[PDB]
């Protein structure tokens, strides 16, 4: 986990994002785009829980950009939130939320669900 | 949203969690729980999109809080992904996802999905 | 639960299903719509899990609705997971996914995710 | 679209299920289980959305399983959201969303979240 987080990570889409993963369970990066209404890199804070593990089981995590920068303003976030397992193809398996800013009416409809893997290499 | 997303809010499950949104949409706070696997408080961290509306939509923010603090290791984590709403009552409606660390075998049954609503009262 | 679950339910939003729960788990009926892209009644169809409880448990089961009658085709589909509880305010509380169909580029933004909870009393 | 959604299909864990998919958009089958608390052949309903689309877009479906036959009882149920893609290499992309019968202390953590994808060929 932390050492084994920290670096470069993509996914199947193209995204790349960058983390360093402090001592005391901080994610701090960023996040570059490839597919979506999102153009350049965004900021990104997480965390990890820093002790995980004598069963070979994930480190779970969790990070977040909202989707402003100088460039682009999405007014959305997202969310994901995973376990990161290492090795040889070490990688980061994980689930997202993504919400929209929506009037009252629309609410119902601010969110999308979807899934991303990471791997150290690209894909 | 920023000066309306700084300070306390509370959930219907009782749990609590005092945020400061930063000027270049940070959000840092502690979330202390009410019902759970975790027993005192927690550190938080996340982000909300600063520049959010002539259409009274809401603010999408996001933000996340590793199971680890001086009494407890859950090995687990969770993301919410949601939008501030300002006025008379305030409120910031979210869904969640917690992820818990797994062997291999049992990543399938990982994450939770569930949805929480915090007002400034309690509840 | 079955002779429980049979009858009409109606959520927040105001939509509104009746639905027969068969002996053997079915579950058949239809879903009126209340609020989204959908116009008049579709048909629905699931299963609930006939043999639930010594300890006050829920009745776990769900629903699929494909948006499709004779005045529209919304091109989507929803399925409600969830758990019915019964007594003197029963309710079903569910957790949904809605799936639009999309061209292979815009499958991340296929899916949304929501939450319904229903009443037999409208609300 | 129903002629190429009728058959049997296989995910990456092994589960496999055949489908058949009626004129006015059912979805009948069963559901054979290869890795959690199932043992066996479970029913199967569903819809699909049976006028999809002259942009090559998915066909949107949704089914439920109830994990109860007569071998097993596992007080849960499934439903899988997503959409078919026809062609050389068919596949079913789906999200579910697995919920326990609980109590109502812990209804907040009955749901789990996953994702699917099923091919014509195994895997
Ligand atoms: N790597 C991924 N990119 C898309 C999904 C979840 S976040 C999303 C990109 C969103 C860009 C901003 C937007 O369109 O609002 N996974
Ligand atoms: N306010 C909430 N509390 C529970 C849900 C999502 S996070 C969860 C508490 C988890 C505690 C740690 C654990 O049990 O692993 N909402
Ligand atoms: N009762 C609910 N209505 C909306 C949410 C989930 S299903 C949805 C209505 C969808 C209508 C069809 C569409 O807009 O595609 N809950
Ligand atoms: N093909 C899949 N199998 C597991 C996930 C979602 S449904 C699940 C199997 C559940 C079996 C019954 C149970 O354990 O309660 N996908």
Redesign the interface.
């Known amino acids: 986990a932390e050492a084994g987080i920290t670096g470069t990570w993509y996914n199947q889409?193209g995204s790349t994002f960058i983390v360093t993963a402090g001592a005391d369970?901080?994610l701090t990066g960023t996040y570059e785009s490839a597919?979506?209404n999102a153009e350049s890199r965004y900021?990104?804070?997480?965390?990890?829980?820093?002790?995980?593990?004598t069963?070979?089981?994930?480190?779970?995590?969790?990070?977040?950009?909202?989707?402003?920068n100088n460039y682009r303003?999405?007014?959305?976030?997202?969310?994901?939130?995973?376990?990161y397992?290492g090795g040889a193809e070490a990688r980061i398996?994980?689930?997202?939320?993504?919400?929209?800013?929506?009037?009252?009416?629309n609410?119902?409809?601010?969110?999308?669900?979807?899934?991303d893997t990471f791997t150290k290499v690209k894909p």
Chains 1, 2, 3, 4 share one sequence.
């Open positions: 889409l369970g901080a597919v979506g900021v990104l804070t997480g965390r990890y829980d820093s002790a995980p593990a069963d070979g089981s994930g480190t779970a995590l969790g990070w977040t950009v909202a989707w402003k303003n999405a007014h959305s976030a997202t969310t994901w939130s995973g376990q397992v398996n994980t689930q997202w939320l993504l919400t929209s800013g929506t009037t009252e009416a609410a119902w409809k601010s969110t999308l669900v979807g899934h």
